[PDB]
Amino acid sequence: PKIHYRKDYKPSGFIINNVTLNINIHDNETIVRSVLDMDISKHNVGEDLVFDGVGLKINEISINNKKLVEGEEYTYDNEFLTIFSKFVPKSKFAFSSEVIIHPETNYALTGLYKSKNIIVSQCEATGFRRITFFIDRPDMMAKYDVTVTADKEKYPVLLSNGDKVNEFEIPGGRHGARFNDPHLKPCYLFAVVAGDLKHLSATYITKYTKKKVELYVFSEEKYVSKLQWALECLKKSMAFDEDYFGLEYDLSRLNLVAVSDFNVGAMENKGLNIFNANSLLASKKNSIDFSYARILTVVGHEYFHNYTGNRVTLRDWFQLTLKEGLTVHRENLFSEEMTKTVTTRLSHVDLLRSVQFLEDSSPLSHPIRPESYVSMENFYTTTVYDKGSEVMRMYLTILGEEYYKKGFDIYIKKNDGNTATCEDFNYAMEQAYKMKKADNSANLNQYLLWFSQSGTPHVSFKYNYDAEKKQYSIHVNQYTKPDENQKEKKPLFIPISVGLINPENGKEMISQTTLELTKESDTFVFNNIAVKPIPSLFRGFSAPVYIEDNLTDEERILLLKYDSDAFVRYNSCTNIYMKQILMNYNEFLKAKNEKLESFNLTPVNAQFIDAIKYLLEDPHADAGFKSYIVSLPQDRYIINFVSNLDTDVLADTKEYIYKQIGDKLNDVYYKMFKSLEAKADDLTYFNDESHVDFDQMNMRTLRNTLLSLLSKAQYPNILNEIIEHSKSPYPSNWLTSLSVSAYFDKYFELYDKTYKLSKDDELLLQEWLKTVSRSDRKDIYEILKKLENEVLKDSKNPNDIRAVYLPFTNNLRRFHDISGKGYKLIAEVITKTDKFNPMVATQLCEPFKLWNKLDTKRQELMLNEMNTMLQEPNISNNLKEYLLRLTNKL
Numbered sequence: 001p002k003i004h005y006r007k008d009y010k011p012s013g014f015i016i017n018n019v020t021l022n023i024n025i026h027d028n029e030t031i032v033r034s035v036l037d038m039d040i041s042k043h044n045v046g047e048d049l050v051f052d053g054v055g056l057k058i059n060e061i062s063i064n065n066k067k068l069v070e071g072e073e074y075t076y077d078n079e080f081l082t083i084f085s086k087f088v089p090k091s092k093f094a095f096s097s098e099v100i101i102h103p104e105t106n107y108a109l110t111g112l113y114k115s116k117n118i119i120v121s122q123c124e125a126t127g128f129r130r131i132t133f134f135i136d137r138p139d140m141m142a143k144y145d146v147t148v149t150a151d152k153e154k155y156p157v158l159l160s161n162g163d164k165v166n167e168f169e170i171p172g173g174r175h176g177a178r179f180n181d182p183h184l185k186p187c188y189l190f191a192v193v194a195g196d197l198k199h200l201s202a203t204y205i206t207k208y209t210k211k212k213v214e215l216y217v218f219s220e221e222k223y224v225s226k227l228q229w230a231l232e233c234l235k236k237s238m239a240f241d242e243d244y245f246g247l248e249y250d251l252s253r254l255n256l257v258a259v260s261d262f263n264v265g266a267m268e269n270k271g272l273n274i275f276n277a278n279s280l281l282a283s284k285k286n287s288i289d290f291s292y293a294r295i296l297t298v299v300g301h302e303y304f305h306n307y308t309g310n311r312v313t314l315r316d317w318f319q320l321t322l323k324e325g326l327t328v329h330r331e332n333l334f335s336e337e338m339t340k341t342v343t344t345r346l347s348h349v350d351l352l353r354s355v356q357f358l359e360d361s362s363p364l365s366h367p368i369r370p371e372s373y374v375s376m377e378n379f380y381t382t383t384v385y386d387k388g389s390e391v392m393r394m395y396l397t398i399l400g401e402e403y404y405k406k407g408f409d410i411y412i413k414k415n416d417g418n419t420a421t422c423e424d425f426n427y428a429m430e431q432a433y434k435m436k437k438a439d440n441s442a443n444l445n446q447y448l449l450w451f452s453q454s455g456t457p458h459v460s461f462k463y464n465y466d467a468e469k470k471q472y473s474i475h476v477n478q479y480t481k482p483d484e485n486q487k488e489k490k491p492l493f494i495p496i497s498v499g500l501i502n503p504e505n506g507k508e509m510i511s512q513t514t515l516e517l518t519k520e521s522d523t524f525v526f527n528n529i530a531v532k533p534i535p536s537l538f539r540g541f542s543a544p545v546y547i548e549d550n551l552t553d554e555e556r557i558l559l560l561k562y563d564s565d566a567f568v569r570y571n572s573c574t575n576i577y578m579k580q581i582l583m584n585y586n587e588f589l590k591a592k593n594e595k596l597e598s599f600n601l602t603p604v605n606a607q608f609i610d611a612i613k614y615l616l617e618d619p620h621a622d623a624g625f626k627s628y629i630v631s632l633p634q635d636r637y638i639i640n641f642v643s644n645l646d647t648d649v650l651a652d653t654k655e656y657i658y659k660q661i662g663d664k665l666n667d668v669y670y671k672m673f674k675s676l677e678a679k680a681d682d683l684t685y686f687n688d689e690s691h692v693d694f695d696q697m698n699m700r701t702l703r704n705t706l707l708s709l710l711s712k713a714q715y716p717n718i719l720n721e722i723i724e725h726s727k728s729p730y731p732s733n734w735l736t737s738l739s740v741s742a743y744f745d746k747y748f749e750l751y752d753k754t755y756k757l758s759k760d761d762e763l764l765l766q767e768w769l770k771t772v773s774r775s776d777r778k779d780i781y782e783i784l785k786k787l788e789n790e791v792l793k794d795s796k797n798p799n800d801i802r803a804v805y806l807p808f809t810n811n812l813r814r815f816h817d818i819s820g821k822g823y824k825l826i827a828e829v830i831t832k833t834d835k836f837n838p839m840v841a842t843q844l845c846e847p848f849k850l851w852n853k854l855d856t857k858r859q860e861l862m863l864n865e866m867n868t869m870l871q872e873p874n875i876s877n878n879l880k881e882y883l884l885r886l887t888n889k890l
């Protein structure tokens, strides 16, 4: 296959300065006329001029008004247009093409496509070449003048990037609009939308320059009532970037548009951000609570790209983490500020240590700046995004707010209106570091290893206390397992945020400090430590690593109770659970393998259970935090700690643990479920789509967590509570009633009730589908068939397909049925979906990423299905690359 290598980057021989487009939409074709004002660069060596262009039907090609002919002056193979060098001018020239495309049959949702009754584009990464010919790479920056025309009754709103400079009527019931985007950009940031869209609008005045910006949010008419929270989130996003980073919006107008059919969450096209409707639309009567946080994060994320991605863009796609890691970091700072709840940072940690750690121990393991690819689309990964964000966050930890802000401003200003690389970012941060250290010989060269080295570091600790001297030492070691990317791993620059807790009184013993580990091992010593402490390590999860605290469970309980840092408290609890999970897993596994008639299980620590009860009963402790402590670690976290995992043994392990704890705590759980009701379900703000009480939402989360535990337990008469909960006006509550009813004969009544409540809102019905799919039902395979036949049917909507199948794949007992029937079901969906949407098919491969971690019978079953998928004729390049890498063939 054609493999692109990071080291081989070279600037083009050509420059494209201006793009002038006419996009004429008709019922059964769209005609795209494009003039590129081009020139020869200083790198040119008289090569052929080669344009990307995929699936285009050529009407005409010319250079400087000279028609070019196929076979004579050019060739086209449905991927690349080659203009032979003799006909490539030697100075400024105009290249003209006209092509025909068909958005109405574009079910891949890349390029120009139809989503219900809206025409929309998605060009990142390689979609612009599906619209017209270009040198489709992000260093080819140009200014754009775009005219869209269409039938006026069908498509009354026409949008492209930038200022709308004219609107005109056209004979035969058509109309046009012309846009000028003054900001130089790569083609991946081009967008156009045409539809019968409705809007909400507001005016925002920038903080420093007092520029008036018109803000528009758009959707189809049915859902215009669901736009207000997005608009509010945009206003919050703009103010945060002003307040924290000093960054103001740079056009007179910003449009956000919701579309029903979208492969991912949203896209930062300049002035014209386009969203999956699931990440832009909500209403409190018709959305679950999680929609609100999702919309806040996604609006924020696309907005933050206006600097980190748009005004400073990528030299090449290997630099992706420079825009995505950095934007995720900006997004997370923003969400943490807006929600003011500790669960926000914890949720991010949970995501990394489950999905990203699994990826990094898989055969798909890559550094955050990859060295090669076949389809760039397969590198939009939780590694590039979420490990990238942690790498961008560690700069903040190392520098502190003031010197971080200085480095970021160095970067954003130096590279404004241009491309950048990961090195450029590291250089700007290094200038801030020298200033912070007041040492112009300090450097961050070692830091670069976070961009180039794959795998997750393991950090381990030993402690010693000298009572006579009042002197404490922390000895720290780091290790990264060799892999396919590096046979020898080097030590990283690891910042370790640390406190020391007095176990007597629970108080802080030092100013929090950040240890800078730069070697394979080091010993950090503290004087004036009056008693032997318990260390509070990696506060805030200060680096993306595996932490081996080497603490006793008694010490972990003391931190859970008394430490200040939410992450350390949560991790201490996580660690106690993991010790128990691995011990019980081993006990169950030995019993199963040895076919014992009897055996013992280690009970859950009774003092840990008491600590859980103490935290839950504390009315001043945080509800969201409580919901993390009564939940075992996610299966995808656990699996990073087990080789040859027997999924059914794990399921029995988790059931035993939950049951041990509930046998002690279920009365506490019920009491709290009832006592939290009044505040959790208070209707303050129910009619206010501009304000969300995140603390209240975390109270609902805790209630819904407790109700699941009590339902699985068959707590006496809990069905009464389930039925009452189904009458709540909050969808998070009535959909929880369906999930928790799985354990009772009432499930199919609740299935019907909630279907009727959900069926008339597209996105609520998708949340109902997820609720059914994740239900802990012994008959889940028959339920899935019922969803396919009655609700999903022949939908090509990625949100429908994802809703039906992905939750079910997390069903540890049922998906991993030792017959392989789960693996076969999902593989058939992948293959089916790959015939029209390769990106979505690759998403649906997610469950297979852990294949080589399973017991050898399940390994064999997964491998069989992966190789069957690989045999499919006309398999996409996206899917074939993914599966070849995943199965150790590429």
Ligand SMILES: *[C](*)C(*)(*)(*)([C][C]([N]C(=O)[N][C]C1=[C]C([C])=C([C])[C]=[C]1)C(=O)[N][O])[C](*)*
Pocket (backbone or CB within 6 Å): 124, 125, 264, 265, 266, 267, 268, 297, 298, 301, 302, 305, 324, 377, 378, 380, 839
């Ligand atoms: C909404 C942001 C995340 C968003 N990216 C995203 O939703 N999915 C990843 C992705 C995958 C592929 C293949 C392509 C081609 C693009 C994106 C984002 O980064 N938005 O700016 C939270």
Ligand SMILES: [Mg+2]
Pocket (backbone or CB within 6 Å): 054, 055, 056, 057, 100, 101, 102
């Ligand atoms: Mg075509």
Ligand SMILES: [Mg+2]
Pocket (backbone or CB within 6 Å): 297, 331
């Ligand atoms: Mg996010």
Ligand SMILES: [Mg+2]
Pocket (backbone or CB within 6 Å): 260, 762, 797
């Ligand atoms: Mg639909």
Ligand SMILES: [Zn+2]
Pocket (backbone or CB within 6 Å): 301, 305, 323, 324, 327
């Ligand atoms: Zn992004």
